[PDB]
Short mmCIF file of C-alpha atoms in Angstrom, two decimals:
data_model
loop_
_atom_site.label_atom_id
_atom_site.label_comp_id
_atom_site.label_asym_id
_atom_site.label_seq_id
_atom_site.Cartn_x
_atom_site.Cartn_y
_atom_site.Cartn_z
CA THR E 43 11.60 -56.15 28.64
CA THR E 44 8.84 -57.64 26.47
CA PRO E 45 5.64 -56.30 24.85
CA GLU E 46 3.82 -59.21 26.53
CA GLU E 47 4.62 -57.61 29.90
CA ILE E 48 3.29 -54.31 28.51
CA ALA E 49 0.04 -56.02 27.49
CA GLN E 50 -0.19 -57.74 30.89
CA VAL E 51 0.30 -54.46 32.78
CA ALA E 52 -2.27 -52.66 30.64
CA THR E 53 -4.68 -55.59 31.02
CA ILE E 54 -4.37 -55.67 34.82
CA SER E 55 -4.72 -51.89 35.09
CA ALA E 56 -7.86 -51.92 32.88
CA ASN E 57 -9.78 -54.30 35.21
CA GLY E 58 -8.91 -57.44 33.26
CA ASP E 59 -9.90 -56.14 29.81
CA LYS E 60 -7.59 -58.01 27.43
CA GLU E 61 -8.60 -55.93 24.40
CA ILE E 62 -7.54 -52.65 26.05
CA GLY E 63 -4.19 -54.19 26.97
CA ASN E 64 -3.73 -55.55 23.45
CA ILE E 65 -4.59 -52.20 21.85
CA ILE E 66 -2.16 -50.37 24.18
CA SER E 67 0.52 -52.95 23.34
CA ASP E 68 -0.10 -52.36 19.62
CA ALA E 69 0.06 -48.58 20.11
CA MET E 70 3.35 -48.88 22.02
CA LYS E 71 4.70 -51.20 19.32
CA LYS E 72 3.80 -48.71 16.58
CA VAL E 73 4.68 -45.29 18.04
CA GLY E 74 7.17 -46.45 20.68
CA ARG E 75 7.04 -46.97 24.44
CA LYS E 76 7.74 -43.24 24.94
CA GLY E 77 5.48 -42.10 22.10
CA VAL E 78 2.36 -39.95 22.16
CA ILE E 79 -0.90 -41.87 22.70
CA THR E 80 -4.14 -39.91 23.15
CA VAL E 81 -7.49 -41.30 24.35
CA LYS E 82 -10.75 -39.88 23.00
CA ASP E 83 -14.38 -40.86 22.48
CA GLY E 84 -15.65 -43.13 19.73
CA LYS E 85 -18.83 -43.13 17.69
CA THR E 86 -18.67 -46.92 17.17
CA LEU E 87 -19.39 -49.77 19.58
CA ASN E 88 -15.81 -51.07 19.50
CA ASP E 89 -12.53 -49.46 20.51
CA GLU E 90 -10.16 -48.61 17.67
CA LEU E 91 -6.53 -47.54 17.27
CA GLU E 92 -5.54 -44.97 14.64
CA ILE E 93 -1.86 -44.38 13.87
CA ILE E 94 -1.15 -40.92 12.44
CA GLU E 95 2.16 -40.89 10.58
CA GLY E 96 4.15 -38.02 9.15
CA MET E 97 3.28 -34.39 9.86
CA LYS E 98 -0.50 -34.02 10.17
CA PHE E 99 -1.88 -30.75 11.56
CA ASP E 100 -5.36 -29.42 12.24
CA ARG E 101 -5.50 -26.88 9.37
CA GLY E 102 -7.41 -27.48 6.15
CA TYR E 103 -7.05 -25.65 2.88
CA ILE E 104 -8.00 -22.00 2.54
CA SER E 105 -9.90 -22.33 -0.74
CA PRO E 106 -12.43 -25.10 -1.53
CA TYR E 107 -11.56 -24.87 -5.26
CA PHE E 108 -8.16 -26.58 -4.68
CA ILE E 109 -9.78 -30.05 -4.70
CA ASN E 110 -8.24 -32.23 -7.41
CA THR E 111 -9.70 -35.49 -6.01
CA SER E 112 -13.46 -35.32 -5.46
CA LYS E 113 -13.73 -38.97 -4.36
CA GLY E 114 -13.22 -37.91 -0.74
CA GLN E 115 -13.22 -34.11 -1.22
CA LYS E 116 -9.47 -33.86 -0.77
CA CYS E 117 -6.40 -32.37 -2.43
CA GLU E 118 -3.87 -35.05 -3.38
CA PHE E 119 -0.40 -34.55 -4.87
CA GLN E 120 2.72 -36.67 -5.33
CA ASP E 121 6.28 -35.26 -5.16
CA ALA E 122 5.23 -31.69 -4.42
CA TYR E 123 7.18 -28.54 -3.64
CA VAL E 124 6.57 -26.89 -0.27
CA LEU E 125 6.71 -23.12 0.35
CA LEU E 126 6.73 -22.36 4.08
CA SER E 127 6.33 -18.92 5.64
CA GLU E 128 5.22 -17.50 8.97
CA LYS E 129 4.05 -14.25 7.33
CA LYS E 130 0.71 -13.91 5.56
CA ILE E 131 1.10 -13.96 1.78
CA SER E 132 -0.93 -11.06 0.36
CA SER E 133 0.77 -9.36 -2.58
CA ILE E 134 1.09 -10.58 -6.17
CA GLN E 135 4.88 -10.19 -6.17
CA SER E 136 5.27 -12.34 -3.04
CA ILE E 137 3.59 -15.30 -4.78
CA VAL E 138 4.55 -15.02 -8.50
CA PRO E 139 8.17 -16.37 -8.34
CA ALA E 140 7.23 -19.52 -6.38
CA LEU E 141 4.55 -20.22 -8.99
CA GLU E 142 7.21 -19.60 -11.65
CA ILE E 143 9.47 -22.32 -10.23
CA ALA E 144 6.50 -24.66 -9.75
CA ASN E 145 5.45 -24.09 -13.38
CA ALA E 146 8.96 -24.35 -14.85
CA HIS E 147 9.77 -27.59 -13.04
CA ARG E 148 6.17 -28.87 -13.51
CA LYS E 149 5.64 -29.86 -9.88
CA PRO E 150 2.79 -29.31 -7.40
CA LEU E 151 3.11 -26.56 -4.80
CA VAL E 152 1.79 -26.55 -1.22
CA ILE E 153 1.96 -23.08 0.33
CA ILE E 154 1.96 -23.35 4.13
CA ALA E 155 1.49 -19.82 5.47
CA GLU E 156 -0.04 -17.93 8.38
CA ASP E 157 -2.79 -16.76 6.01
CA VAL E 158 -3.41 -15.97 2.35
CA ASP E 159 -5.12 -12.66 1.57
CA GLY E 160 -7.60 -12.05 -1.23
CA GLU E 161 -5.14 -11.00 -3.93
CA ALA E 162 -2.80 -14.00 -3.66
CA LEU E 163 -5.76 -16.35 -3.14
CA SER E 164 -7.46 -15.01 -6.27
CA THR E 165 -4.22 -15.50 -8.22
CA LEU E 166 -3.93 -19.08 -6.93
CA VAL E 167 -7.56 -20.00 -7.67
CA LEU E 168 -7.43 -18.35 -11.11
CA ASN E 169 -4.28 -20.28 -12.02
CA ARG E 170 -5.80 -23.49 -10.63
CA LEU E 171 -9.06 -23.19 -12.57
CA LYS E 172 -8.06 -21.45 -15.81
CA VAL E 173 -4.71 -22.95 -16.86
CA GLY E 174 -4.68 -25.83 -14.35
CA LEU E 175 -1.89 -25.11 -11.87
CA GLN E 176 -1.32 -27.77 -9.20
CA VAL E 177 -1.32 -25.59 -6.08
CA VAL E 178 -2.88 -25.68 -2.61
CA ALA E 179 -2.74 -23.09 0.18
CA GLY N 98 -2.89 20.07 -33.66
CA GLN N 99 -3.82 16.57 -34.83
CA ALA N 100 -7.33 15.13 -34.60
CA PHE N 101 -8.00 11.47 -33.74
CA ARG N 102 -11.43 9.93 -34.46
CA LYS N 103 -13.11 13.32 -35.02
CA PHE N 104 -11.68 14.71 -31.77
CA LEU N 105 -9.01 17.40 -31.49
CA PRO N 106 -7.86 18.54 -28.02
CA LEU N 107 -7.53 22.25 -27.31
CA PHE N 108 -4.45 24.19 -26.11
CA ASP N 109 -1.61 21.90 -24.89
CA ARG N 110 -3.78 18.89 -24.01
CA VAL N 111 -2.63 15.48 -25.27
CA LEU N 112 -4.95 12.52 -25.87
CA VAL N 113 -3.34 9.09 -25.42
CA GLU N 114 -4.34 5.43 -25.54
CA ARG N 115 -3.17 3.40 -22.56
CA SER N 116 -1.25 0.22 -23.32
CA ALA N 117 -2.80 -3.20 -22.81
CA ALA N 118 -2.48 -4.57 -19.29
CA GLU N 119 -0.17 -7.54 -18.83
CA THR N 120 -2.16 -10.75 -18.31
CA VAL N 121 0.61 -13.38 -18.23
CA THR N 122 4.12 -13.44 -16.82
CA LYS N 123 7.31 -14.29 -18.71
CA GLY N 124 7.13 -17.84 -17.33
CA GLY N 125 3.42 -18.36 -17.91
CA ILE N 126 1.53 -17.50 -14.71
CA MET N 127 -1.86 -15.89 -15.28
CA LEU N 128 -2.62 -12.62 -13.49
CA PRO N 129 -6.02 -11.61 -12.11
CA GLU N 130 -7.63 -8.72 -13.96
CA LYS N 131 -8.66 -6.88 -10.79
CA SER N 132 -5.11 -6.39 -9.47
CA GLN N 133 -3.59 -4.80 -12.59
CA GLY N 134 -4.46 -1.20 -11.76
CA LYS N 135 -3.78 1.43 -14.42
CA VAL N 136 -1.11 1.19 -17.11
CA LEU N 137 1.40 4.05 -16.98
CA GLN N 138 2.60 3.38 -20.55
CA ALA N 139 0.60 5.01 -23.35
CA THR N 140 0.84 6.06 -26.98
CA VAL N 141 0.02 9.58 -28.13
CA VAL N 142 -2.92 9.48 -30.54
CA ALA N 143 -3.87 13.18 -30.57
CA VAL N 144 -2.13 16.48 -29.82
CA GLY N 145 -3.42 20.02 -29.40
CA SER N 146 -2.28 23.29 -30.90
CA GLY N 147 -0.29 24.35 -27.83
CA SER N 148 -0.24 26.96 -25.11
CA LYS N 149 0.63 30.68 -25.14
CA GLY N 150 3.18 31.03 -22.35
CA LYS N 151 5.09 33.65 -24.34
CA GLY N 152 3.39 36.47 -26.20
CA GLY N 153 3.19 36.43 -29.97
CA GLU N 154 4.01 32.92 -31.16
CA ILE N 155 2.28 29.73 -30.00
CA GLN N 156 4.49 26.99 -28.57
CA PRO N 157 4.02 23.56 -30.22
CA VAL N 158 3.52 20.47 -28.08
CA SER N 159 6.72 18.59 -27.23
CA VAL N 160 5.24 15.18 -28.07
CA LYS N 161 3.89 14.15 -31.47
CA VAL N 162 1.38 11.59 -32.75
CA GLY N 163 2.69 8.05 -32.42
CA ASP N 164 5.09 8.61 -29.50
CA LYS N 165 5.15 6.13 -26.62
CA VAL N 166 5.04 8.04 -23.33
CA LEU N 167 5.01 7.40 -19.59
CA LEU N 168 2.04 8.74 -17.69
CA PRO N 169 1.78 9.96 -14.09
CA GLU N 170 -0.54 8.06 -11.79
CA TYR N 171 -2.85 11.10 -11.45
CA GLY N 172 -3.89 13.86 -13.81
CA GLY N 173 -5.86 12.04 -16.52
CA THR N 174 -9.32 12.74 -17.91
CA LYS N 175 -11.40 9.87 -19.31
CA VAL N 176 -12.75 10.46 -22.84
CA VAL N 177 -15.05 7.92 -24.49
CA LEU N 178 -14.52 7.82 -28.26
CA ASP N 179 -16.33 5.08 -30.24
CA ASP N 180 -17.08 3.39 -26.88
CA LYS N 181 -13.31 3.15 -26.27
CA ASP N 182 -11.39 4.77 -23.43
CA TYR N 183 -8.77 7.46 -24.06
CA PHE N 184 -6.99 9.73 -21.59
CA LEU N 185 -6.46 13.49 -21.77
CA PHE N 186 -3.34 14.86 -20.06
CA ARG N 187 -1.39 18.10 -20.23
CA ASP N 188 1.85 18.57 -22.14
CA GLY N 189 3.81 19.26 -18.96
CA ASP N 190 2.20 16.36 -17.10
CA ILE N 191 3.92 13.80 -19.35
CA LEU N 192 7.00 12.35 -17.65
CA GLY N 193 9.02 11.15 -20.63
CA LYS N 194 8.83 9.41 -23.97
CA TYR N 195 10.54 6.25 -25.19
CA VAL N 196 12.88 6.96 -28.09
CA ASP N 197 14.17 4.28 -30.46
CA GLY P 3 18.53 15.58 -23.79
CA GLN P 4 20.10 12.18 -23.16
CA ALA P 5 18.20 8.89 -23.34
CA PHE P 6 18.92 5.98 -20.98
CA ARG P 7 17.56 2.47 -21.71
CA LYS P 8 15.34 3.88 -24.49
CA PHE P 9 13.83 6.45 -22.10
CA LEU P 10 14.20 10.21 -22.52
CA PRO P 11 12.68 12.46 -19.82
CA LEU P 12 10.77 15.53 -20.97
CA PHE P 13 11.35 19.21 -20.05
CA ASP P 14 13.74 19.63 -17.07
CA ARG P 15 13.19 16.19 -15.53
CA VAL P 16 16.28 14.20 -14.54
CA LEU P 17 16.36 10.40 -14.29
CA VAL P 18 18.82 9.02 -11.73
CA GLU P 19 19.58 5.67 -10.13
CA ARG P 20 20.11 5.39 -6.39
CA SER P 21 23.41 4.12 -5.03
CA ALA P 22 23.60 0.75 -3.31
CA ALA P 23 22.59 0.75 0.34
CA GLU P 24 25.29 0.06 2.91
CA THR P 25 25.15 -3.53 4.16
CA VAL P 26 28.21 -3.67 6.45
CA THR P 27 29.90 -1.00 8.53
CA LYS P 28 33.53 0.08 8.37
CA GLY P 29 34.44 -2.34 11.16
CA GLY P 30 32.37 -5.29 9.98
CA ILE P 31 28.93 -5.11 11.62
CA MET P 32 26.07 -6.25 9.39
CA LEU P 33 23.00 -4.04 9.10
CA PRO P 34 19.42 -5.28 8.58
CA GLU P 35 17.99 -4.47 5.16
CA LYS P 36 14.66 -3.22 6.54
CA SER P 37 16.22 -0.29 8.44
CA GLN P 38 18.28 1.24 5.60
CA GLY P 39 15.57 3.54 4.27
CA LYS P 40 16.17 5.33 0.97
CA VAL P 41 19.60 6.27 -0.35
CA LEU P 42 19.98 10.01 -0.91
CA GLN P 43 23.07 9.60 -3.13
CA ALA P 44 22.39 8.95 -6.81
CA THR P 45 24.04 9.23 -10.21
CA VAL P 46 22.45 10.95 -13.20
CA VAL P 47 21.70 8.49 -16.00
CA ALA P 48 19.34 10.62 -18.13
CA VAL P 49 18.62 14.32 -18.60
CA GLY P 50 15.81 16.15 -20.36
CA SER P 51 15.85 18.97 -22.88
CA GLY P 52 15.13 21.66 -20.28
CA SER P 53 12.47 24.16 -19.30
CA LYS P 54 11.37 27.44 -20.91
CA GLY P 55 11.48 29.85 -17.97
CA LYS P 56 12.70 32.67 -20.22
CA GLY P 57 11.26 33.42 -23.64
CA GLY P 58 13.11 32.49 -26.80
CA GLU P 59 15.89 30.03 -26.04
CA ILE P 60 15.68 26.87 -23.92
CA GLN P 61 17.77 26.47 -20.77
CA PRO P 62 19.96 23.34 -20.55
CA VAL P 63 19.79 21.24 -17.40
CA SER P 64 22.33 22.07 -14.70
CA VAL P 65 23.43 18.45 -14.25
CA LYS P 66 24.73 16.13 -16.97
CA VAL P 67 24.92 12.37 -17.48
CA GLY P 68 27.41 10.75 -15.13
CA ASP P 69 27.11 13.25 -12.27
CA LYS P 70 26.80 12.05 -8.68
CA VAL P 71 24.06 14.05 -6.94
CA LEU P 72 22.33 14.30 -3.57
CA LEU P 73 18.60 13.72 -3.62
CA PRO P 74 15.91 15.23 -1.40
CA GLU P 75 13.95 12.88 0.82
CA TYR P 76 10.72 13.69 -1.07
CA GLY P 77 9.78 14.38 -4.67
CA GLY P 78 10.81 11.36 -6.76
CA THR P 79 8.83 9.29 -9.26
CA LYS P 80 9.53 5.57 -9.58
CA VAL P 81 10.22 4.40 -13.15
CA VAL P 82 10.70 0.70 -13.92
CA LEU P 83 13.15 0.17 -16.79
CA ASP P 84 14.20 -3.43 -17.59
CA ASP P 85 12.64 -4.44 -14.24
CA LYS P 86 15.06 -2.05 -12.51
CA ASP P 87 14.15 0.96 -10.39
CA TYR P 88 15.04 4.51 -11.41
CA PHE P 89 13.88 7.84 -10.01
CA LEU P 90 12.63 10.92 -11.85
CA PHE P 91 13.26 14.28 -10.18
CA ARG P 92 13.17 17.89 -11.30
CA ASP P 93 16.23 19.99 -12.11
CA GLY P 94 15.56 22.38 -9.23
CA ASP P 95 14.81 19.56 -6.79
CA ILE P 96 18.44 18.37 -6.85
CA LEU P 97 20.32 19.69 -3.82
CA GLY P 98 23.92 19.48 -5.02
CA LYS P 99 26.38 17.39 -6.98
CA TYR P 100 29.72 15.89 -5.96
CA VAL P 101 32.65 17.31 -7.94
CA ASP P 102 35.85 15.28 -8.13
CA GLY M 72 30.12 28.25 -7.05
CA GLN M 73 32.50 27.02 -4.35
CA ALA M 74 32.86 23.36 -3.36
CA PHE M 75 33.48 22.06 0.17
CA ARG M 76 34.79 18.50 0.69
CA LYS M 77 33.86 17.37 -2.85
CA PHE M 78 30.34 18.82 -2.57
CA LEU M 79 29.01 21.79 -4.53
CA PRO M 80 25.41 22.96 -3.96
CA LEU M 81 23.29 23.76 -7.00
CA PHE M 82 21.47 27.02 -7.87
CA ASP M 83 21.33 29.47 -4.91
CA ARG M 84 21.70 26.90 -2.12
CA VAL M 85 24.24 27.65 0.62
CA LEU M 86 25.94 24.95 2.71
CA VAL M 87 26.92 26.08 6.21
CA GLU M 88 28.49 24.61 9.34
CA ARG M 89 26.66 25.39 12.57
CA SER M 90 28.72 26.84 15.40
CA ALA M 91 29.55 24.80 18.49
CA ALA M 92 26.77 24.83 21.08
CA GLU M 93 27.65 26.50 24.37
CA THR M 94 28.05 24.37 27.50
CA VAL M 95 29.69 26.67 30.09
CA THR M 96 28.42 30.13 31.04
CA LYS M 97 30.57 33.21 31.62
CA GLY M 98 30.61 32.55 35.38
CA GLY M 99 31.47 28.85 35.23
CA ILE M 100 28.17 26.92 35.35
CA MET M 101 28.06 23.80 33.19
CA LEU M 102 25.02 23.52 30.93
CA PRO M 103 23.14 20.35 29.93
CA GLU M 104 23.64 19.42 26.29
CA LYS M 105 20.02 18.35 25.74
CA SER M 106 18.63 21.80 26.60
CA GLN M 107 20.80 23.64 24.06
CA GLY M 108 18.60 23.33 20.97
CA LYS M 109 20.01 24.26 17.57
CA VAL M 110 22.65 26.94 17.05
CA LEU M 111 21.41 29.80 14.88
CA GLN M 112 24.96 31.03 14.19
CA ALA M 113 26.79 29.35 11.31
CA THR M 114 29.68 29.90 8.93
CA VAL M 115 29.35 29.60 5.15
CA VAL M 116 31.50 26.75 3.85
CA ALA M 117 29.98 26.30 0.37
CA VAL M 118 27.98 28.43 -2.07
CA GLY M 119 26.18 27.61 -5.30
CA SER M 120 26.22 29.26 -8.70
CA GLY M 121 23.01 31.22 -8.13
CA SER M 122 19.44 31.47 -9.33
CA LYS M 123 17.92 32.89 -12.53
CA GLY M 124 15.47 35.48 -11.21
CA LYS M 125 16.28 37.78 -14.14
CA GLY M 126 16.80 36.51 -17.66
CA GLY M 127 20.20 36.53 -19.29
CA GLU M 128 22.88 36.93 -16.63
CA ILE M 129 23.44 34.67 -13.62
CA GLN M 130 23.06 36.23 -10.17
CA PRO M 131 25.87 35.57 -7.66
CA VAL M 132 24.97 34.50 -4.14
CA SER M 133 24.87 37.30 -1.57
CA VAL M 134 27.08 35.44 0.91
CA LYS M 135 30.58 34.12 0.24
CA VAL M 136 32.72 31.34 1.70
CA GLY M 137 34.00 32.26 5.15
CA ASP M 138 31.09 34.50 6.18
CA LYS M 139 29.43 34.13 9.58
CA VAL M 140 25.64 34.16 9.17
CA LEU M 141 22.49 33.89 11.28
CA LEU M 142 20.15 31.04 10.44
CA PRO M 143 16.36 30.86 10.83
CA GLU M 144 14.67 28.25 13.00
CA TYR M 145 13.54 26.06 10.07
CA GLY M 146 14.32 25.67 6.38
CA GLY M 147 17.58 23.72 6.55
CA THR M 148 18.47 20.31 5.14
CA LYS M 149 20.90 17.96 6.87
CA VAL M 150 23.87 16.85 4.74
CA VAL M 151 26.34 14.29 6.09
CA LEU M 152 29.84 14.93 4.70
CA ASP M 153 32.69 12.80 6.13
CA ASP M 154 30.26 11.76 8.90
CA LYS M 155 29.92 15.44 9.87
CA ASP M 156 26.71 17.47 9.83
CA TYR M 157 26.21 20.48 7.57
CA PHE M 158 23.06 22.41 6.73
CA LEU M 159 21.76 23.44 3.31
CA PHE M 160 19.71 26.65 3.17
CA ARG M 161 18.59 29.02 0.44
CA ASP M 162 20.22 32.35 -0.34
CA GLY M 163 17.08 34.27 0.65
CA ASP M 164 16.54 32.20 3.80
CA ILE M 165 19.67 33.67 5.43
CA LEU M 166 18.73 36.45 7.84
CA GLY M 167 21.97 38.42 8.03
CA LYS M 168 25.73 38.13 8.21
CA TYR M 169 28.19 39.41 10.81
CA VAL M 170 30.62 41.93 9.34
CA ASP M 171 33.88 42.95 11.01
#
């Protein structure tokens, strides 16, 4: 019934290590007692807990030129439009109207797709570099 | 026939200048220059004398100088006049002209 | 000849627009849009002046503006007028027209 | 030209209805429908105005409406009128008609 019992169970099961029990109690407090907790290696001396919030997936951007924040080599937008598709965006005509809405409403656009072929990618990079369109594939 | 920049086509051949390729959309999205292809809209800058399909008289060309026309995707010959590109077609190869 | 949307086809070419593809059946079953193909029923929106198969006079086109026609499966040229699709055929390529 | 179910073919095209494929022999053996092929016997249900092989006059079609004809293996076009199949041929493509 209490997180103290959770910490005690995780401490006993980890051969008396109180820090492992405390970190498991913190993880179960953050993501829930039925949440997803994954153990992996660390490059530091001490154990650490990282809480990943929202929808984070293992895919980076397609084009390196989309970086608008070079402080950490990342693309950063606030209040952005999202265009989602399971088909690879290749043609010009399949990418112009979404850019038209994103330019008319003056909002960033994140295009999550299976892939982006050379024609649509060249259009996106040319609009990002030349006129300064806030887009990321 | 009518000669344009010291060049007059022979028979029913028509020399046209292709229209400028569209670089921006109506909303303001830039287009890459490699994906434009060839412009099918042209303006007639030179006409020939005409063919001889019927004996006796010589048939004039249907189009005239200064007529906007629609080109087929094939059938053009590149002519370099004053280091500028022009296209030679036939009179029958022209699809249709824009009247106003 | 007759001009549609500031476009007049040349010689015996005929500009038509295809009829709308069927989306539901007569009983109410929806059809997918990817399996419709091309509509063979069109209406004539523009006609040319005509060809010169015989010497002297010029032959008018068989069809006129406002005639529903049946198109062949091959032999059309796509023309974009006002960002709308139209098809250019020849006068002899038209199979037959619907008389009412 | 003669029209059939609000359809009139153009030039020298002839619209015919193929005869019913046989399924029972003269002795009483039923035949499979898949191994029947296409029926080469048809009846003329629509004719066009005719072609312009000679200048001036217009040439009537050789066949008329209500004539039984023999079709070649190829050269026909499928036309769906009232969800029923008809075949468009040329005037010269018809092999011969059955007189009585």
